[PDB]
Amino acid sequence: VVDQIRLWQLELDRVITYEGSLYSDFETSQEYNLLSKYAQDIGVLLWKDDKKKKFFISKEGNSQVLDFAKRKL
């Protein structure tokens, strides 16, 4: 019957959304790889994609990675 709707609602409650910042437009693979590995290391990396040279960082990690970026590039 339609407790198919019930399984849809359950899956709907398994959606996750985060505030933060998408980083993109990198000159070099090196720099993209440097910041995302730093973000991975301090636990604030939520998503990345090597081929697009993009990643997303949580809000609470935002200034740590900006400050790392100023210091190391």
Partner: protein, 58 residues
């Protein structure tokens, strides 16, 4: 080299498809389709999307 604030939405492909259809008709919701299970969404619209999704089930 560039940062932009947003809301990262992580969801099953089935629900991604509903979101994109909600966006088709309301238009102002999806900034970028990131991969199979991730969307970059207008932060002000997360409420609305979560509200609208829930309603589609009724």
């Amino acid at each position: 080299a560039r940062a932009r604030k947003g809301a990262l939405v992580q969801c099953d492909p089935s629900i991604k498809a509903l979101i994109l259809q909600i966006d088709a008709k309301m238009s102002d919701i999806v900034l970028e389709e990131l991969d199979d299970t991730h969307l970059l969404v207008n932060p002000s619209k997360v409420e609305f999307v979560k509200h609208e999704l829930n309603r589609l089930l009724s």
